[model samples]
Target: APLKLNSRNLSQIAAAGGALVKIPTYQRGRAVKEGIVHIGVGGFHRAHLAVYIDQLMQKHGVNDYAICGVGLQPFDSAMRDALASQDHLYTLIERSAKGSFAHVIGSINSYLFAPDNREAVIAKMAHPDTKIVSLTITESGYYYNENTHELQSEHPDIQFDLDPANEKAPRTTFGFLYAGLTRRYQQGLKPFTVMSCDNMQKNGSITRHMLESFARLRNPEVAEWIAEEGAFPNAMVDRITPQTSETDKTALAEKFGIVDSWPVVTEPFTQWVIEDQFSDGRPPFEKVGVQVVKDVHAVEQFEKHKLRLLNGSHSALGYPGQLAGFQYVHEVMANPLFRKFVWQMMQEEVKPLLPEIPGVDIDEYCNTLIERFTNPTIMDQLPRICLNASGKIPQFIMPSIAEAIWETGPFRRLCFVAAAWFHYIKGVDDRGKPFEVVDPMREELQAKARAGGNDPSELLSIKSLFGDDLRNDERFLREITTAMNDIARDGIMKTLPKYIN
Candidate 1:
């Protein structure tokens, strides 16, 4: 086997069979003049934004826009180590039923472990050359209480970062952003745009709100400056990137004769629609294939459609699929009853709640989604989808349920999803197989599940997730209870036909 991939070994790797390595033109042997500092160096960020920036550098000579990847938490320590070894260069393998295509991405030039050196991370952000500071920090990283729509002031990290005594060493993203922007303000330099590439409706607005709120708690003047100068552009980012397993790493070495410590695998499909608002300057993204739009409201329509229809269906199918002894998402799609349940959930329950996006055919979009879900080549795991159910359910699944509650009584399909989620948290499947339920609120949810016993309403009554309004709705309570009861009694296979058929 060839030694693990690095910048020095690219030439030798390319000489081997069928491997691809397209290095930048001006960026070859050129020092990266950092223009973007991106937080959360994850698979999706590499698959989507980094690929765009890498392409932009190669095609347009926008060599200054190379990324400085930042890892805030200890979980990101692994990423820091991997990117450092490879010179911030790694392969992206786009997989589909047709075939697999590979390309080496070289947009990220530096990696910073914030826990190691906080000042360096902030220094890169505060630098005058840096034009954009973007984020792919998962939805939970924002530290916002969904029900309150405010920054969670009581969160230990937030509290520590917010303290005046601890201002010199901050922990949260809001702290790093605020501190960096404050430094730029003190130096009279332009503030970089804070673009959120997370999957949430009005995500940029949410980012601005949380950052400003956190800043206000510490320094009112800095908060005011940020409010006037900072730009947080709402963006819609899409692409299904699966977690790279050790099996994937070994497969790459065997097939391509090159070893990558942490390569990314993603579906062929990619889309990014960003609101055209930036404080300093942005890459000529429109020069590339990105849709830089004026009215982000239209962009938001697409967000709602994807969040509810695509993501909601994932959450809806995730729990039941896991309980039914299926491992991969494609496995879930292979089951006739599981497949019908999600299709009906999207078409009948979720699609009706979406606003019409200009020039988008909703039916075709849903069909495409089904095809993507059913792609046999991508081993997208069901347990992975079920990983942050507490967060996923509220952000992706519950909105449609909340909307339909006032308009159409209880939508039983949405109710079935809720029941499945509630039942899955019991920490054991219908086959009596014990699985680890991973969530921030796992213990609380398990307690609710235990208390509920036979009644699903006990789980629903947890006001943080379902809220008081939905919990009080008798129809909502009754349907969820019925589904939970049926699933417990007859198992998912027998129970699914009752609703989906």
Candidate 2:
């Protein structure tokens, strides 16, 4: 049996031809050596990096390396329970052209709830065994400010930390890392590599800037020390691990005969490209599937196009479609007009902005994205928790839309999408139901939409959304105003057909 595994579903898993017993490291292999302390410790980390680490340890017999999860937030406890219950053994269902394969990963040695024992967490950071500190805390966890391209110092979490100025003051991941690193610095230890696996542009630079800024605010000497000692690797990570659903759980129990209360289902695709920068220690991730390279920025740009054009456009479709009584991305994409609108926007607008990555072919990339988006088997639901735009949409996506309108001429599909975002945030859905605005601009967006005219341009008029640089540009603003006006006049369905057809 898997170590520390719970009694929730062991019998079913075993009766199912023991598929879950593919490998249990401690049973057949040597002990674990501490090498990485992964923060956030969410489902994505478990399904992605932790899976890779388990394989690497088995393949190379790297005895001194493994992962210890750290949960910075309350929901993080959900991941903790899921992992600990299974004795840190989670199944990664890898889907590919060949077929689906399930493998149990057991690289996570332990887990730590940061809030429950902040001091112990700090001591862990200070430990020499922990060479790498990584995060998948997602976009919102960074508290990044788009305009300044730095940490939002005035963020509620940061303010909470700065105000109380005590042991339990840290709120944002940036703040939490700052305090943790400060502890390491005081111990006269070398700063570990800080890697952000989140889907954000210039992620390394962004985190580095935030850490330095926080250090400077706290102390000059510490700021300088961090600048010289720490390393932040730029990375482009891609995966479609959807949150667990009832159907997924039921299917695991019925089809596979494994009762999985916290099973994670994902599209067969996964990609990770990392900058070759590290200190103290590193993993042989390149030997496996991960690509360790000299430059990640170019890959970063290409991936953003895929995300904003495919994923962002999907969100644009999802929000409006759900309110308009549609169900899924495929459901909306299935419509002739919506399908044409999405493709046209990609070709005319998103394509021009992408200069291409080192190894990527833009045409093939987009072709694959469309194919993935229209996957017949994958069901991406509208209400499976996508209201966290504050965390998900900003720097990676919205900028691309704004850039498209600014660089090209007035774009009708993008305009409708923007208009739909405003319509979605109007504090109510089409069914006369009040839907919570999940973005940080929730208050201002509702206020503007309520007070002003029902125009897309009026919604984009918010300086933060448009940004001073784009908003002040007369040509850019005019196109936005023109396109938005058109969207308001002719609803999305009619307007999309008009432009795409």
Candidate 3:
């Protein structure tokens, strides 16, 4: 049996795993105290946010920043189950070129699965000790329009939370936040700071908008207080955390002699750039090497680089990558044709458009991204990367395309991505193999794509994603159609080399 990891076996686990294990030094019951209520506890949280707090406790002796983790969704119950027996301890396996190492982090004080008792979670947040409520609830969890920064009040989740029928069982973050603040307001305690760690631009302001918007709908009195007094610090967090699967857990036990139900496996690179602003109290995050700045413009530069170079390459490679019959990211990186195409797009198309940040060499950054994608440990699949193409393309790829057109830069390589994307969405590859293209607009996209074929006008007309500029530009349409025509004559395998050469 792979040994179960818990507080009891800390010494035993450290000794047995040899080089594989590195346990926290602090006594959690004594040195750590709860001051934060974290909304999500997935791999990103374990790898990035909690790791910083763990370091603060261990090295800096900062005892006021332990986290009380909260889980809202039904699936979150599984995480609660996994950590219950382990004393809320989980392993963070960082797989880098140097080697793989295991870290048993001890920043989480307790986890309260909120679906079972939503009131308890609200009370926990309302408690005097809870000074900060941080969220890593993914992009969709916010229920706001990305462009407008407005609350999607009519969203099903929002509606469900607003309905008194679901009052006892709150369905969304806003509902729980409102209830928590109501209790705090009733007790005359100061409202806790709301910090958003999502990758969206001005994420802090967006959260404040939505939360305050939701509060206004419920009660204008407390809404004013939340808006006036509460601080929502905008933050930017970056790390290459891969989706941890079941086999990884067993593999750890078999190879390293430690069994963890959920282990967050990620690359070595980690970053956190946050606004120094907070409401109740702020942790000395700067002391622990976190970027706490007066202005988030520096943060924007970091986010823009990651989104454009790193995430942009993923989208650029994704559609064509699937049709070309490459399964995993590493497989594509192994091919010179595929690798060269990505490198050229980054260097010629995306890199030139990105604003110059002081200390960042775009060439070096591009090279690092290539190296990261080439890492065999993280099996980033083409299908997985291609899942939400509609959302991702607008956010990552289109920015470069737009900028290229605006600046009159070489964008033929960029247009090829969109052309291949038009072919990929037909629910069948050029080789005639059928595969699911998962998207909210799957059927509609397939309908337009299959009908338009080489023209691609129907799919490109979407004002929401591609925008008016891409749709209306005659030259852009011509570029896309020309490549589509080439792809029609020869399959993705041959057509890609045409661009590469």
Q: Residue 165 lDDT in model 1?
A: 86
lDDT of 1 by residue, 263-364 (tens): 999897888999888999988998778878786786777777888888888886698888888888888887788778888887788878878866678889
| Residue-level lDDT for 89 in candidate 2 | 63
Q: By TM-score, is 1 or 3 better?
A: 3
Q: Residue-wise lDDT of candidate 3 within 1-501, one digit each (tens)?
A: 467889888788888888778898787865566899999878788899999999888888888889999998889988998888789888889896677888888999799998788889988989998999999888788898876768999988898888878766776888888889988899998889998877678888888999999988888999999999898888788787988888888888887788888888988777788877788997799877787867667677778988988888887778888887778887777788878899998888888888896656889878888888888888888999999788888888778888888877878878888788888888677777888889998888888887786888889877666788887777787888898888766877787777774
How big is the positional error of residue 25 in model 3, measured in Å on the Cα after superposition?
0.4
Task: Give Cα distance to truth, residue 41, candidate 2, Å.
Answer: 1.6
The worst-scoring run of ten residues by lDDT in candidate 3 lies at 24-33
Regions more than 4 Å wrong, model 2? 1-30, 58-63, 72-81, 93-101, 114-120, 138-189, 213-222, 245-251, 257-261, 319-324, 375-412, 415-497
Over 4 Å off, model 1: 1-4, 17-32, 72-81, 113-120, 139-172, 200-202, 217-219, 376-412, 415-501
In order, candidate lDDTs are: 0.84, 0.68, 0.84
TM for candidate 3 is 0.88
Ranking of all predicted structures according to lDDT, beginning with the best and ending with the worst: 3, 1, 2
Q: Worst ten-residue run, lDDT, model 2?
A: 1-10
Q: What's the ranking of the predictions by TM-score, best on top?
A: 3, 1, 2
